[PDB]
Symmetry: C2
Subunit: 199 residues, 2 copies
Amino acid sequence: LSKRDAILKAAVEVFGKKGYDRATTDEIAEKAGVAKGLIFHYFKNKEELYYQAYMSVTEKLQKEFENFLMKNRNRDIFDFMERWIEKKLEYSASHPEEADFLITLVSVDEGLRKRILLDLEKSQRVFFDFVREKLKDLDLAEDVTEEIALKFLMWFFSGFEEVYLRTYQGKPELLKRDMNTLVEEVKVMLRILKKGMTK
Amino acid sequence: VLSKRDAILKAAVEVFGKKGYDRATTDEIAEKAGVAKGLIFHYFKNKEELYYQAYMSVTEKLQKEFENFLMKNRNRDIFDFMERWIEKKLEYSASHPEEADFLITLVSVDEGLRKRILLDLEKSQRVFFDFVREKLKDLDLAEDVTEEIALKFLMWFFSGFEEVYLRTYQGKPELLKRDMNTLVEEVKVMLRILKKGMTK
C-alpha cells in the first residue's frame, strides 16, 4: 500500500466515522501513518482529498460490477438484477467503512456534491445501458413500453435504496441477520415485476 | 368567505411557498390575508408556530380527501382503488401549486419543527397502508408472494415513485402539467403490472 492509497484508505475511515466537517486532515494523516504535509502534497485540499477517496471507492464498486457483469451478462435481466443486488448487499455488510463513507455525500459542500453526483452517473452508465438493452429483449406485455419498464425499475430501486439507508446504515450486524430475508424478498419482488411486465 | 384565522393560514401557505421560511414575513402574510399584523401573533405564537399550523391545515386537507375516497371507492379491487387514488393525488398536486411549493419548504426549516412535522406525516397515511394491508388478505397471491412481501413491495415502490416525482417536478408546475398525460398513463400500466405479477 503506497502512501497515497493509505491516505485514501484513512480518509474513507475518518470521513465515514466523523462526517465531512468534523474530520480533519491531521486525523487522516495519523491514521495513515504519514506526515501531515503529504496530504496536501497528494491532494490540494480537504475537498479534493474527499473527492478522490470518493472516486477511489466508486472505482472499486465499478470493478466489482465489471467482474459481475462479465460473469453474469447472459442471464435474464431480472435474474441478473437479483444477483447483483445480493452482491451489492453482501459487499456493504463486509465493507462497513466504505458504506459509512459513501453516505456522507449528503453532508457535503454544494459544489463538491454536484461534482461527485455527475461522476456517479458516469460510473454507472454501463449498468443502465445494459439494463435498457436487456429490457429490449423481453416480450413486454400490452402497454408496457421500454420507457415504462425502466421508470418502474428505477422507482423501485430508489425506494429500496431509501429503506436500506433508513434501516441498515451503520448497522452491519443487523444487515447480516436480515440478509436471508432481504435477498428472498428481493428475489420475489423481481419475479413479480417479471411476471407482470412480460407476456 | 374564510374566517380571519383561516384566511391567515391560506396566506401563509402562499407566502411561505413563494419566499421560503426565512424570507417570508408576517407583514406579507397579514397583507395577503387582509388583516392587521397583530392578529397573526394573536392567533399563532410566532412564525414557527404559524408554519406548523399552516402545514397541518394542508395535510388535514389532503387527509380528508383520502378518507372520503376510502369510503366512496372502498371495496374496489385494491389495485384499482390504488390506481384511482394515485390519479386523484396527481390531479390535486397539479391544481394546487401554491400548496406544493409550500410543502417543499419543509427541508429548509428548523430541525425541531421539521421532526415535529415529520411525526405527524408518519401518522398521516397509516390509514392508507392499514387498508392496503387488510385488502391483501382478500387476494389470491402468487406462489412465494407472502402478504408481508406484498406490502413491503408496494411501500418501497410508492416511496421511490414519490421521491423521483419530488426531484423531477419540485419548482416546475410547467413540467408537471406538460407531463401529466404520460404520468397518468404510466400509473395505469404500472398498477396492471402489479396486479398481474402479484396475484395468481
